[PDB]
Design a protein around this ligand. Structure first.
Ligand SMILES: [Mg+2]
Length: 93
RNA sequence: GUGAGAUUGUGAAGGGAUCUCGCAGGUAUCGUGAGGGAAGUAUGGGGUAGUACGAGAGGAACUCCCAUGCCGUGCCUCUAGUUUCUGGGGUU
């Protein structure tokens, strides 16, 4: 983000992202039981949400459901570079 | 088989055969829902916010409330309209 801290809540499988570009809308995703949702503390990494499971295309599916809720609408996306972006794809073991 | 009719072109009482269909439904209520029809559509305000963005000039948006235009289906408590209740009165 550029100006507004994106606040991503994680309780259970549910995930709530608020304050995306200062909007008052809350965006809601119900992650399946096959994928676990974690969150790194801001001591180590600034803001990371962790999607882990066994199916590749259920972990990759949920990380792009999350990417596409937070899309900039009716402004220039070259200037408004805000969102939730996948940077790394790893294993657990 | 059993009931009911008819055989009406030349008089009458008789009674033979034959043909036609009647022989099981009527009445009353609660539902099914195929198929067909098919509808709601727009707007402004509040705050978000003078914030995002921007050198400045300027200048957004969603959740969320509050109303409104056009349309639709009704309704008659109120208000308004209508009076051959010629209702009560007035007046030529
Ligand atoms: Mg239908």
């Amino acid at each position: 983000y550029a100006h507004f801290p994106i606040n991503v809540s994680v309780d259970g499988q549910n995930i709530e992202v608020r304050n995306f570009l200062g909007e008052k809308r809350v965006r809601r995703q119900l992650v399946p039981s096959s994928v676990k949702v974690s969150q790194t503390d801001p001591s180590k990494v600034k803001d990371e949400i962790i999607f882990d499971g066994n199916d590749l295309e259920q972990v990759s599916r949920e990380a792009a459901v999350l990417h596409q809720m937070c899309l900039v609408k009716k402004k220039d996306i070259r200037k408004f570079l805000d969102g939730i972006y996948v940077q790394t794809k790893t294993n657990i073991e």
